[PDB]
Amino acid sequence: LSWSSANKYNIQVGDIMVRDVTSIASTSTYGDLLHVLRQTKLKFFPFVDTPDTNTLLGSIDRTEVEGLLQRRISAYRRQPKQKGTGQVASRFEEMLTLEEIYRWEQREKNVVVNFETCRIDQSPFQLVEGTSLQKTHTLFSLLGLDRAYVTSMGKLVGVVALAEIQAAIEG
Amino acid sequence: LSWSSANKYNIQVGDIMVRDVTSIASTSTYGDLLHVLRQTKLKFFPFVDTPDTNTLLGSIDRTEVEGLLQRRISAYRRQPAAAAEADEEFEEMLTLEEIYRWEQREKNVVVNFETCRIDQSPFQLVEGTSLQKTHTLFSLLGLDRAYVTSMGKLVGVVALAEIQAAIEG
């Protein structure tokens, strides 16, 4: 003779995941890049199909985005005691001024970016909404992750950060 | 009428194993669970990876499945414990009409086999295996049903009944 019942916790990536993701799509412009760099602190972004479709194609590093932008800026002016100005005289020729870079983005702020010389990284996992907070935590622990992208059949749906996960697991 | 009159030779799990297994996968819903319970009489099922990949991760008991379902149902009518199911018209009891409505709403919700107990099999039974070795396997472990696998993948079920009969016919 016996009875039947029970209870439990039941949290999931979705009741933690941020649905407003700062992503970079193959259709974004150099203005989009500068924005992501200036308006965030993220060390990497999800590299999407298109802001509409949202097919997660991988992720791009901040240092990788900074590179594309640098290669562009330089490959544009590529023409081939006085007052001191501020300038990113990289390379080693003759101070490429800061006023120039300001005017640079004014001119190419809407030019779609060419992510060809850029390195997109493939994720070694798949994290879906239904996933339990415990399996999501174990995933982060075994791979040593800080941020993971939750997908839905290839499409970006949100971002989960280990911080948010731990806190949710303690609340 | 009917017909018959045959026999067998050097038989193997495969020439006996049922290839259409009723399994439970980690991706199945609560409807799948209610299905397996209402349409079968099995005491346990093979717990698979995905119905597609079919990695045999273990096996779930019927009582175990009934539990997960029970735990769901109750932890859906809000929060709280203490209330038996029942044919309506003694209070705070999940009425049978509610449970009906329950499966109508959670029928396609994938199940969380976390609170559930999955049992690891102590053996490996492959297709190439001879009907004599499979019988000895069942005999020593005292089995009724065994899952035949192919490199981790669920391939079919063999029942002791089927084995004995095969060994006599």
UniProtKB/Swiss-Prot annotation, chain A:
<protein>
    <recommendedName>
        <fullName>Chloride channel protein</fullName>
    </recommendedName>
</protein>
<comment type="subunit">
    <text>Homodimer. Each subunit contains a channel ('Double barreled channel').</text>
</comment>
<feature type="domain" description="CBS 2">
    <location>
        <begin position="120"/>
        <end position="171"/>
    </location>
</feature>
<comment type="similarity">
    <text>Belongs to the chloride channel (TC 2.A.49) family. ClC-0 subfamily.</text>
</comment>
<feature type="domain" description="CBS 1">
    <location>
        <begin position="17"/>
        <end position="75"/>
    </location>
</feature>
<comment type="function">
    <text>Voltage-gated chloride channel. This channel is thought to ensure the high conductance of the non-innervated membrane of the electrocyte necessary for efficient current generation caused by sodium influx through the acetylcholine receptor at the innervated membrane.</text>
</comment>
